[PDB]
Amino acid sequence: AQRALLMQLQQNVIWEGTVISDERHHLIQHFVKLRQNPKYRSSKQMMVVGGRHLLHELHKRGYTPRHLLVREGQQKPKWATNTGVKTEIIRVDRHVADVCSPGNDGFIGDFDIPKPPPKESLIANKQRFDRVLVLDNVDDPGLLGTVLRTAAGFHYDAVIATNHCADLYDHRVIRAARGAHFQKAVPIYTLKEEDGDNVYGMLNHILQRNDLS
Amino acid sequence: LHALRPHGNWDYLPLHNNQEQQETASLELQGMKASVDIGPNRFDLNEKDLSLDEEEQVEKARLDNELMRWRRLQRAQGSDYDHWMEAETRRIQEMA
Amino acid sequence: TLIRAAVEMGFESVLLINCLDPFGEKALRASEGTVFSPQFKIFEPGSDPVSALNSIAVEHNLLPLLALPSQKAETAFEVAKNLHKINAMRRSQENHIGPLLILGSEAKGLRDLAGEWSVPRKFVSVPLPNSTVESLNVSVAGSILIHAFRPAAEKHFVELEESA
Amino acid sequence: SHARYRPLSLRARQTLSEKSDDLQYHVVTQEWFGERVDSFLTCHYPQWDYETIKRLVQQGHIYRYRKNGKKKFTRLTDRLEFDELLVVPTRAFWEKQLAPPSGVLEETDGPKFKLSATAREMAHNMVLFKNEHVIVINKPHGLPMMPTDDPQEMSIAAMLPAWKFTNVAKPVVCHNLDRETSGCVVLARTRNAHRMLGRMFVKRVVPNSVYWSFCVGKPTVNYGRVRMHFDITRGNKGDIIVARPSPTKTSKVAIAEFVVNASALEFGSFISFYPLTTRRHQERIMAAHALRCPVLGDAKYGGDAAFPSSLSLFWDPENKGLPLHLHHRKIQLPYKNTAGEFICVTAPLPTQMEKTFKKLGWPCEVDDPLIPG
Amino acid sequence: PPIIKPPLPVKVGTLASTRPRSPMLADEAEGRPTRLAPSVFGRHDAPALQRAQQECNQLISASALARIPNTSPRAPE
Amino acid sequence: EVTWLDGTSYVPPVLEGASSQDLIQMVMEEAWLAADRMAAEGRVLNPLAIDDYKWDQLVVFKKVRDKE
Ligand SMILES: [Mg+2]
């Protein structure tokens, strides 16, 4: 009994030499709560990203997660093993990785949510906005992620999400966007009427200020 | 989005390649980019331009006095004979 | 989604090489019966893609355009304008030439066909100025290519030529 | 391991030093006339540490010969003399059956372990008292102090690199504790501090440690002095401990002073031990056999009476996984605070022992006036 | 393997090495010779020691080292 | 030379050791005094409110509050 309790203790205290096998682990519970609960996700300011190639691109850009879950049978990333990174690496089994994320490529990064752009630019911008995208009441996250991806590709001056939108830090939108949240070219702002900010007031101010149709 | 993408009107600006090439670019076209259109042109905007209130000024003076007394107290804290001899021989090697 | 875009913008037939399932249920969900439509004809070549494409191209007098990540020609709008201008010149002379679209996944497999394409060939891409993102979704790129080389857009391009 | 060291008396060490030939006889020319021995050695051997030179000179491995036929031993403060020799052992001198001091050789740390942020937070939580000389931590229950047979099992001896907040090297544990003991563990920061504090943990007459325990049953006397002689012998799978009342040439004595704080209807009792020796499972075996009342949870010594039907009301006798009620409550230190009283640090009881004391109505956090400070 | 180690110039010390063990010891380090002291590398007899001396061109006895200086007898031009 | 809405001429003296911030403080103190004079004489003055300069200043305010 003492050996079993000490093994479970080390599992909770993942100190090198053990892999995770139970979904009741604190880190797996943190991952699944960050994936499901949007309020807890916004309170923790973290997100879950899947894909070794996407994680490598984020590292190239300069973004690295504080936690990485690698599936057994796959090697460790060079960008995760180099000395400049502070990313902890944890071995994960197949079914617990599926419980963590519904789609497991073998690499799951617990990234820090990039700070949303300050609305002060949209309020009082020096340069004139050429074209601004306004997404209104999108239901499924796939379409939202794809339109974020194509907006980042076409380099729109600003993107706004008005009055209804899937949480931009959700796994599906993250997959369908592939770095649109981490990039800093196209600023995106989620204006939720229930939060106090007037979407139509903001839009009419932008119009009357930048002479937009 | 592909229709109303940014700079998508450049295909319609020039009605013909000959008419487009007839125009000659000048350094004025480069110079006009440095001027912000909506806002007025200003020289510098740094942290020193931030005006302070009376409470902020009093707090800053208090922090400066605290820093002064902290330097004074560290002159005696680091005066432990080991570190004091260390700094003394370092100054000697600097001047020599 | 690609089949639906093609048939909604007015495409007649489609070719599938190395496709997973032309009638899988998860594909029919996104297609919304557009593959079942009678005016939309699907085809399948047997391990002979180059001989399947070059023959039909040289027979039906069609211009192929490949959506490659190469930077040969990135202005799909100007490429479509040139194609519609050639079509309008043929119409004024009076046959018409139709657009072939090539949407692929692997650059190696696309070069394997580009190195053996017949005359004339053009590599068309999308105007993406951001170096951060690699490329758009293949479905979005195909939809943009169809919107460019739509057989109904020839009338609007003739209107553009008249207005210019 | 090309040289296997052997025990050596002073006579044998002198005989080997005389017989050896791996020596270096430095003359003292006019340039080194009157220089101190320590300055001479620190100027001649840049690779030898000052503490190493001190140990060599004060032990006598580096002596001087004044041409008088006999060798002369000096301290560090002694001045040299013209025309005389200074004898220094070489590298090959320590390759015989003569054990060298610690500093003269090079000790390789080898492989190091990489700790996670969660483990570092757990260590910072375990830290109780921090000082520029000593660090006191609260070791949890069921944790191995030293790496056991299984190399994949965690231990405290490998958590050392996470405790050096500013030191150049990891702290060193002063005394080891049993796996089941849930007490406080002391670490020394300075290599000299470890040597200075190692004297406290030898057999003594006045106690400076407190062990809170909950035994099954009430002993005869409320306060007493337990003493028994242990014999440890190697066996097939483990060790055999033989306890005797009478001394023996091979026996090692074990002494403690026990005080019964409270009694729970003569079926359970709370007691405080103050040991005077350091023996394996000392207080546990004392409470098991001498007091004739085993501590609740000592399955290895009297497992049947460990989990009693009496206390079965509170805990399930079929699980047999409750933490052993063995807590190093209070331990003194030679260091004084600003008030002048010696610093005696106290470790809080684990949550399971707190639950037991709450179910029994006894206060969980009480000061121990027997050991002052 | 030389039998007699001749004097060698002292090694340049780092900061911590040239730092004395005490600020009062910081004064003894003022006068120090720039050369180490010669030595022997074993226990040998008188003929072996004399042969090592004549081979390495170095004397062992400090008395003789001081009494016999290597001086050019000629007068300076 | 500084001329206000009324037309009064004021000259901030410039001496050695006087900094640009010193001159700014002098000019702004005299400007507050002149504005008090206008309001007492009866001249109406545009009041201070939130402007694009105030937003550009909150930019560096956010910068310094994120710094420390
Ligand atoms: Mg003894």
Side-chain angles (χ1 to χ4, degrees), chain A residues 57 61 146 149-150 152-155 178-179 183 185-186, chain C residues 126-130 132-138 140 144:
Chain A
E57 296 288 347
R61 295 179 182 179
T146 316
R149 185 178 186 176
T150 183
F154 285 110
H155 194 298
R178 195 174 190 86
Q183 84 162 27
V186 178
Chain C
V126 297
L128 209 170
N130 301 80
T132 58
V133 293
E134 182 264 343
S135 177
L136 300 84
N137 184 23
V138 288
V140 177
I144 299 318

PDB file of all heavy atoms in Angstrom, chain A residues 57 61 146 149-150 152-155 178-179 183 185-186, chain C residues 126-130 132-138 140 144:
ATOM      1  N   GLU A  57       5.838  25.884 -35.524  1.00  0.00           N
ATOM      2  CA  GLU A  57       5.659  27.213 -36.102  1.00  0.00           C
ATOM      3  C   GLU A  57       5.517  28.271 -35.014  1.00  0.00           C
ATOM      4  O   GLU A  57       6.061  29.376 -35.134  1.00  0.00           O
ATOM      5  CB  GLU A  57       4.440  27.225 -37.026  1.00  0.00           C
ATOM      6  CG  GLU A  57       4.565  26.324 -38.247  1.00  0.00           C
ATOM      7  CD  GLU A  57       5.547  26.852 -39.277  1.00  0.00           C
ATOM      8  OE1 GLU A  57       5.952  28.029 -39.173  1.00  0.00           O
ATOM      9  OE2 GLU A  57       5.911  26.089 -40.196  1.00  0.00           O
ATOM     10  N   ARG A  61       7.915  31.476 -34.312  1.00  0.00           N
ATOM     11  CA  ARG A  61       7.440  32.840 -34.108  1.00  0.00           C
ATOM     12  C   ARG A  61       7.951  33.410 -32.790  1.00  0.00           C
ATOM     13  O   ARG A  61       8.270  34.601 -32.702  1.00  0.00           O
ATOM     14  CB  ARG A  61       5.913  32.878 -34.154  1.00  0.00           C
ATOM     15  CG  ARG A  61       5.327  32.516 -35.507  1.00  0.00           C
ATOM     16  CD  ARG A  61       3.810  32.555 -35.473  1.00  0.00           C
ATOM     17  NE  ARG A  61       3.225  32.157 -36.749  1.00  0.00           N
ATOM     18  CZ  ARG A  61       1.918  32.086 -36.978  1.00  0.00           C
ATOM     19  NH1 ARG A  61       1.057  32.385 -36.015  1.00  0.00           N
ATOM     20  NH2 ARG A  61       1.471  31.714 -38.169  1.00  0.00           N
ATOM     21  N   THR A 146     -11.874  29.195 -39.625  1.00  0.00           N
ATOM     22  CA  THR A 146     -11.487  29.324 -41.025  1.00  0.00           C
ATOM     23  C   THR A 146     -11.544  30.775 -41.488  1.00  0.00           C
ATOM     24  O   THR A 146     -10.679  31.223 -42.252  1.00  0.00           O
ATOM     25  CB  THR A 146     -12.378  28.446 -41.901  1.00  0.00           C
ATOM     26  OG1 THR A 146     -12.528  27.159 -41.290  1.00  0.00           O
ATOM     27  CG2 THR A 146     -11.750  28.269 -43.269  1.00  0.00           C
ATOM     28  N   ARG A 149      -8.586  32.483 -40.145  1.00  0.00           N
ATOM     29  CA  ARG A 149      -7.417  32.113 -40.936  1.00  0.00           C
ATOM     30  C   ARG A 149      -7.349  32.919 -42.228  1.00  0.00           C
ATOM     31  O   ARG A 149      -6.302  33.482 -42.570  1.00  0.00           O
ATOM     32  CB  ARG A 149      -7.451  30.614 -41.234  1.00  0.00           C
ATOM     33  CG  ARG A 149      -6.226  30.077 -41.949  1.00  0.00           C
ATOM     34  CD  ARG A 149      -6.348  28.576 -42.156  1.00  0.00           C
ATOM     35  NE  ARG A 149      -5.135  27.991 -42.718  1.00  0.00           N
ATOM     36  CZ  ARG A 149      -4.964  26.690 -42.928  1.00  0.00           C
ATOM     37  NH1 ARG A 149      -5.931  25.835 -42.621  1.00  0.00           N
ATOM     38  NH2 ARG A 149      -3.827  26.242 -43.442  1.00  0.00           N
ATOM     39  N   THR A 150      -8.464  32.997 -42.957  1.00  0.00           N
ATOM     40  CA  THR A 150      -8.440  33.721 -44.225  1.00  0.00           C
ATOM     41  C   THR A 150      -8.319  35.227 -44.017  1.00  0.00           C
ATOM     42  O   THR A 150      -7.740  35.918 -44.861  1.00  0.00           O
ATOM     43  CB  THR A 150      -9.674  33.388 -45.066  1.00  0.00           C
ATOM     44  OG1 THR A 150      -9.582  34.054 -46.331  1.00  0.00           O
ATOM     45  CG2 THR A 150     -10.938  33.833 -44.377  1.00  0.00           C
ATOM     46  N   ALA A 152      -6.534  36.623 -41.498  1.00  0.00           N
ATOM     47  CA  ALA A 152      -5.104  36.777 -41.260  1.00  0.00           C
ATOM     48  C   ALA A 152      -4.312  36.629 -42.551  1.00  0.00           C
ATOM     49  O   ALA A 152      -3.268  37.270 -42.715  1.00  0.00           O
ATOM     50  CB  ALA A 152      -4.629  35.759 -40.224  1.00  0.00           C
ATOM     51  N   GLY A 153      -4.790  35.795 -43.476  1.00  0.00           N
ATOM     52  CA  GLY A 153      -4.102  35.647 -44.748  1.00  0.00           C
ATOM     53  C   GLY A 153      -4.232  36.870 -45.636  1.00  0.00           C
ATOM     54  O   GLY A 153      -3.255  37.310 -46.246  1.00  0.00           O
ATOM     55  N   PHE A 154      -5.435  37.435 -45.723  1.00  0.00           N
ATOM     56  CA  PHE A 154      -5.663  38.623 -46.539  1.00  0.00           C
ATOM     57  C   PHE A 154      -5.248  39.913 -45.843  1.00  0.00           C
ATOM     58  O   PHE A 154      -5.342  40.982 -46.460  1.00  0.00           O
ATOM     59  CB  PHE A 154      -7.136  38.708 -46.952  1.00  0.00           C
ATOM     60  CG  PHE A 154      -7.515  37.746 -48.042  1.00  0.00           C
ATOM     61  CD1 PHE A 154      -8.337  36.664 -47.779  1.00  0.00           C
ATOM     62  CD2 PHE A 154      -7.054  37.931 -49.334  1.00  0.00           C
ATOM     63  CE1 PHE A 154      -8.687  35.781 -48.783  1.00  0.00           C
ATOM     64  CE2 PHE A 154      -7.400  37.050 -50.341  1.00  0.00           C
ATOM     65  CZ  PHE A 154      -8.218  35.974 -50.065  1.00  0.00           C
ATOM     66  N   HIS A 155      -4.804  39.843 -44.588  1.00  0.00           N
ATOM     67  CA  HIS A 155      -4.241  40.986 -43.869  1.00  0.00           C
ATOM     68  C   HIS A 155      -5.262  42.118 -43.732  1.00  0.00           C
ATOM     69  O   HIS A 155      -5.065  43.235 -44.214  1.00  0.00           O
ATOM     70  CB  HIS A 155      -2.960  41.484 -44.548  1.00  0.00           C
ATOM     71  CG  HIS A 155      -2.148  42.416 -43.702  1.00  0.00           C
ATOM     72  ND1 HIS A 155      -2.625  43.634 -43.266  1.00  0.00           N
ATOM     73  CD2 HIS A 155      -0.888  42.311 -43.218  1.00  0.00           C
ATOM     74  CE1 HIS A 155      -1.696  44.235 -42.545  1.00  0.00           C
ATOM     75  NE2 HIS A 155      -0.632  43.454 -42.501  1.00  0.00           N
ATOM     76  N   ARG A 178      -5.091  28.040 -36.932  1.00  0.00           N
ATOM     77  CA  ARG A 178      -3.678  27.687 -37.081  1.00  0.00           C
ATOM     78  C   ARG A 178      -2.783  28.926 -37.009  1.00  0.00           C
ATOM     79  O   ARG A 178      -2.118  29.311 -37.974  1.00  0.00           O
ATOM     80  CB  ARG A 178      -3.444  26.904 -38.378  1.00  0.00           C
ATOM     81  CG  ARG A 178      -2.100  26.196 -38.433  1.00  0.00           C
ATOM     82  CD  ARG A 178      -1.971  25.324 -39.668  1.00  0.00           C
ATOM     83  NE  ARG A 178      -0.785  24.475 -39.604  1.00  0.00           N
ATOM     84  CZ  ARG A 178      -0.753  23.283 -39.018  1.00  0.00           C
ATOM     85  NH1 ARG A 178      -1.845  22.794 -38.445  1.00  0.00           N
ATOM     86  NH2 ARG A 178       0.369  22.576 -39.004  1.00  0.00           N
ATOM     87  N   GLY A 179      -2.784  29.557 -35.836  1.00  0.00           N
ATOM     88  CA  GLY A 179      -1.896  30.666 -35.558  1.00  0.00           C
ATOM     89  C   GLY A 179      -2.495  32.045 -35.728  1.00  0.00           C
ATOM     90  O   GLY A 179      -1.791  33.037 -35.491  1.00  0.00           O
ATOM     91  N   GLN A 183      -0.646  35.290 -34.036  1.00  0.00           N
ATOM     92  CA  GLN A 183      -0.056  36.338 -34.853  1.00  0.00           C
ATOM     93  C   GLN A 183      -0.478  37.714 -34.344  1.00  0.00           C
ATOM     94  O   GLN A 183      -1.480  37.869 -33.639  1.00  0.00           O
ATOM     95  CB  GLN A 183      -0.459  36.177 -36.318  1.00  0.00           C
ATOM     96  CG  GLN A 183      -1.809  36.775 -36.658  1.00  0.00           C
ATOM     97  CD  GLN A 183      -1.982  36.994 -38.144  1.00  0.00           C
ATOM     98  OE1 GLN A 183      -1.377  36.298 -38.961  1.00  0.00           O
ATOM     99  NE2 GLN A 183      -2.803  37.972 -38.506  1.00  0.00           N
ATOM    100  N   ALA A 185      -0.408  40.510 -36.637  1.00  0.00           N
ATOM    101  CA  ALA A 185      -0.645  41.354 -37.803  1.00  0.00           C
ATOM    102  C   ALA A 185      -2.079  41.872 -37.827  1.00  0.00           C
ATOM    103  O   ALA A 185      -2.313  43.084 -37.876  1.00  0.00           O
ATOM    104  CB  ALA A 185      -0.334  40.578 -39.085  1.00  0.00           C
ATOM    105  N   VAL A 186      -3.050  40.964 -37.794  1.00  0.00           N
ATOM    106  CA  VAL A 186      -4.466  41.316 -37.832  1.00  0.00           C
ATOM    107  C   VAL A 186      -4.982  41.325 -36.396  1.00  0.00           C
ATOM    108  O   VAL A 186      -5.122  40.247 -35.793  1.00  0.00           O
ATOM    109  CB  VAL A 186      -5.265  40.337 -38.702  1.00  0.00           C
ATOM    110  CG1 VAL A 186      -6.737  40.700 -38.683  1.00  0.00           C
ATOM    111  CG2 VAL A 186      -4.730  40.335 -40.123  1.00  0.00           C
TER     112      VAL A 186
ATOM    113  N   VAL C 126      -2.815  32.733 -54.665  1.00  0.00           N
ATOM    114  CA  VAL C 126      -3.685  33.734 -54.056  1.00  0.00           C
ATOM    115  C   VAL C 126      -2.836  34.882 -53.525  1.00  0.00           C
ATOM    116  O   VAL C 126      -1.673  34.670 -53.151  1.00  0.00           O
ATOM    117  CB  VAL C 126      -4.547  33.112 -52.946  1.00  0.00           C
ATOM    118  CG1 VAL C 126      -5.475  32.057 -53.527  1.00  0.00           C
ATOM    119  CG2 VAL C 126      -3.663  32.511 -51.864  1.00  0.00           C
ATOM    120  N   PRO C 127      -3.359  36.108 -53.483  1.00  0.00           N
ATOM    121  CA  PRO C 127      -2.586  37.251 -52.948  1.00  0.00           C
ATOM    122  C   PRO C 127      -2.521  37.268 -51.422  1.00  0.00           C
ATOM    123  O   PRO C 127      -3.277  37.942 -50.724  1.00  0.00           O
ATOM    124  CB  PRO C 127      -3.347  38.457 -53.504  1.00  0.00           C
ATOM    125  CG  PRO C 127      -4.752  37.975 -53.641  1.00  0.00           C
ATOM    126  CD  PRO C 127      -4.656  36.530 -54.042  1.00  0.00           C
ATOM    127  N   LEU C 128      -1.582  36.495 -50.881  1.00  0.00           N
ATOM    128  CA  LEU C 128      -1.379  36.414 -49.438  1.00  0.00           C
ATOM    129  C   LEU C 128      -0.125  37.189 -49.061  1.00  0.00           C
ATOM    130  O   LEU C 128       0.992  36.712 -49.318  1.00  0.00           O
ATOM    131  CB  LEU C 128      -1.264  34.955 -48.994  1.00  0.00           C
ATOM    132  CG  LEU C 128      -1.722  34.575 -47.581  1.00  0.00           C
ATOM    133  CD1 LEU C 128      -1.745  33.064 -47.428  1.00  0.00           C
ATOM    134  CD2 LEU C 128      -0.840  35.195 -46.511  1.00  0.00           C
ATOM    135  N   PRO C 129      -0.248  38.376 -48.459  1.00  0.00           N
ATOM    136  CA  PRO C 129       0.938  39.169 -48.118  1.00  0.00           C
ATOM    137  C   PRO C 129       1.564  38.853 -46.769  1.00  0.00           C
ATOM    138  O   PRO C 129       2.620  39.420 -46.457  1.00  0.00           O
ATOM    139  CB  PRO C 129       0.386  40.599 -48.125  1.00  0.00           C
ATOM    140  CG  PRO C 129      -1.013  40.432 -47.644  1.00  0.00           C
ATOM    141  CD  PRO C 129      -1.497  39.118 -48.211  1.00  0.00           C
ATOM    142  N   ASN C 130       0.957  37.984 -45.965  1.00  0.00           N
ATOM    143  CA  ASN C 130       1.464  37.682 -44.634  1.00  0.00           C
ATOM    144  C   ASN C 130       2.429  36.505 -44.692  1.00  0.00           C
ATOM    145  O   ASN C 130       2.081  35.431 -45.193  1.00  0.00           O
ATOM    146  CB  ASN C 130       0.314  37.374 -43.677  1.00  0.00           C
ATOM    147  CG  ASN C 130      -0.667  38.518 -43.563  1.00  0.00           C
ATOM    148  OD1 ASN C 130      -1.523  38.703 -44.426  1.00  0.00           O
ATOM    149  ND2 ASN C 130      -0.553  39.292 -42.491  1.00  0.00           N
ATOM    150  N   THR C 132       3.518  35.098 -41.976  1.00  0.00           N
ATOM    151  CA  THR C 132       3.268  34.268 -40.802  1.00  0.00           C
ATOM    152  C   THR C 132       2.546  32.981 -41.187  1.00  0.00           C
ATOM    153  O   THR C 132       3.055  31.877 -40.963  1.00  0.00           O
ATOM    154  CB  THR C 132       2.458  35.052 -39.769  1.00  0.00           C
ATOM    155  OG1 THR C 132       1.224  35.485 -40.356  1.00  0.00           O
ATOM    156  CG2 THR C 132       3.239  36.266 -39.292  1.00  0.00           C
ATOM    157  N   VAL C 133       1.359  33.106 -41.770  1.00  0.00           N
ATOM    158  CA  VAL C 133       0.579  31.941 -42.165  1.00  0.00           C
ATOM    159  C   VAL C 133       1.127  31.385 -43.472  1.00  0.00           C
ATOM    160  O   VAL C 133       1.554  32.135 -44.360  1.00  0.00           O
ATOM    161  CB  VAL C 133      -0.912  32.304 -42.284  1.00  0.00           C
ATOM    162  CG1 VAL C 133      -1.482  32.643 -40.915  1.00  0.00           C
ATOM    163  CG2 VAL C 133      -1.104  33.468 -43.244  1.00  0.00           C
ATOM    164  N   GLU C 134       1.125  30.056 -43.590  1.00  0.00           N
ATOM    165  CA  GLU C 134       1.662  29.414 -44.785  1.00  0.00           C
ATOM    166  C   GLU C 134       0.701  29.554 -45.959  1.00  0.00           C
ATOM    167  O   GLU C 134       1.048  30.126 -46.999  1.00  0.00           O
ATOM    168  CB  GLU C 134       1.964  27.941 -44.493  1.00  0.00           C
ATOM    169  CG  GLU C 134       2.566  27.173 -45.660  1.00  0.00           C
ATOM    170  CD  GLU C 134       1.527  26.412 -46.458  1.00  0.00           C
ATOM    171  OE1 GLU C 134       0.406  26.219 -45.941  1.00  0.00           O
ATOM    172  OE2 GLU C 134       1.828  26.007 -47.600  1.00  0.00           O
ATOM    173  N   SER C 135      -0.516  29.041 -45.809  1.00  0.00           N
ATOM    174  CA  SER C 135      -1.524  29.134 -46.857  1.00  0.00           C
ATOM    175  C   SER C 135      -2.896  28.945 -46.228  1.00  0.00           C
ATOM    176  O   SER C 135      -3.024  28.491 -45.088  1.00  0.00           O
ATOM    177  CB  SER C 135      -1.281  28.102 -47.964  1.00  0.00           C
ATOM    178  OG  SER C 135      -2.298  28.162 -48.948  1.00  0.00           O
ATOM    179  N   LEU C 136      -3.924  29.301 -46.992  1.00  0.00           N
ATOM    180  CA  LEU C 136      -5.296  29.143 -46.536  1.00  0.00           C
ATOM    181  C   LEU C 136      -5.694  27.669 -46.573  1.00  0.00           C
ATOM    182  O   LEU C 136      -4.925  26.793 -46.983  1.00  0.00           O
ATOM    183  CB  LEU C 136      -6.248  29.974 -47.395  1.00  0.00           C
ATOM    184  CG  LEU C 136      -6.067  31.492 -47.480  1.00  0.00           C
ATOM    185  CD1 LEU C 136      -5.025  31.875 -48.518  1.00  0.00           C
ATOM    186  CD2 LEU C 136      -7.395  32.159 -47.791  1.00  0.00           C
ATOM    187  N   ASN C 137      -6.918  27.392 -46.132  1.00  0.00           N
ATOM    188  CA  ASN C 137      -7.473  26.057 -46.282  1.00  0.00           C
ATOM    189  C   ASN C 137      -7.604  25.717 -47.761  1.00  0.00           C
ATOM    190  O   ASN C 137      -7.839  26.590 -48.603  1.00  0.00           O
ATOM    191  CB  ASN C 137      -8.834  25.963 -45.591  1.00  0.00           C
ATOM    192  CG  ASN C 137      -9.418  24.563 -45.634  1.00  0.00           C
ATOM    193  OD1 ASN C 137      -8.694  23.580 -45.790  1.00  0.00           O
ATOM    194  ND2 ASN C 137     -10.735  24.467 -45.495  1.00  0.00           N
ATOM    195  N   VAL C 138      -7.428  24.434 -48.080  1.00  0.00           N
ATOM    196  CA  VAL C 138      -7.531  24.003 -49.471  1.00  0.00           C
ATOM    197  C   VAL C 138      -8.932  24.253 -50.008  1.00  0.00           C
ATOM    198  O   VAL C 138      -9.101  24.612 -51.179  1.00  0.00           O
ATOM    199  CB  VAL C 138      -7.120  22.523 -49.608  1.00  0.00           C
ATOM    200  CG1 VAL C 138      -5.618  22.375 -49.429  1.00  0.00           C
ATOM    201  CG2 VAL C 138      -7.862  21.668 -48.596  1.00  0.00           C
ATOM    202  N   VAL C 140     -10.986  26.731 -49.056  1.00  0.00           N
ATOM    203  CA  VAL C 140     -11.111  28.165 -49.299  1.00  0.00           C
ATOM    204  C   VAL C 140     -10.365  28.556 -50.568  1.00  0.00           C
ATOM    205  O   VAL C 140     -10.861  29.349 -51.379  1.00  0.00           O
ATOM    206  CB  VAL C 140     -10.611  28.958 -48.079  1.00  0.00           C
ATOM    207  CG1 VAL C 140     -10.666  30.451 -48.353  1.00  0.00           C
ATOM    208  CG2 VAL C 140     -11.436  28.610 -46.853  1.00  0.00           C
ATOM    209  N   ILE C 144     -12.033  30.174 -53.920  1.00  0.00           N
ATOM    210  CA  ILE C 144     -11.576  31.421 -54.524  1.00  0.00           C
ATOM    211  C   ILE C 144     -11.207  31.201 -55.985  1.00  0.00           C
ATOM    212  O   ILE C 144     -11.495  32.041 -56.847  1.00  0.00           O
ATOM    213  CB  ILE C 144     -10.399  32.007 -53.723  1.00  0.00           C
ATOM    214  CG1 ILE C 144     -10.835  32.315 -52.290  1.00  0.00           C
ATOM    215  CG2 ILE C 144      -9.858  33.257 -54.397  1.00  0.00           C
ATOM    216  CD1 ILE C 144     -12.201  32.947 -52.194  1.00  0.00           C
TER     217      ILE C 144
END
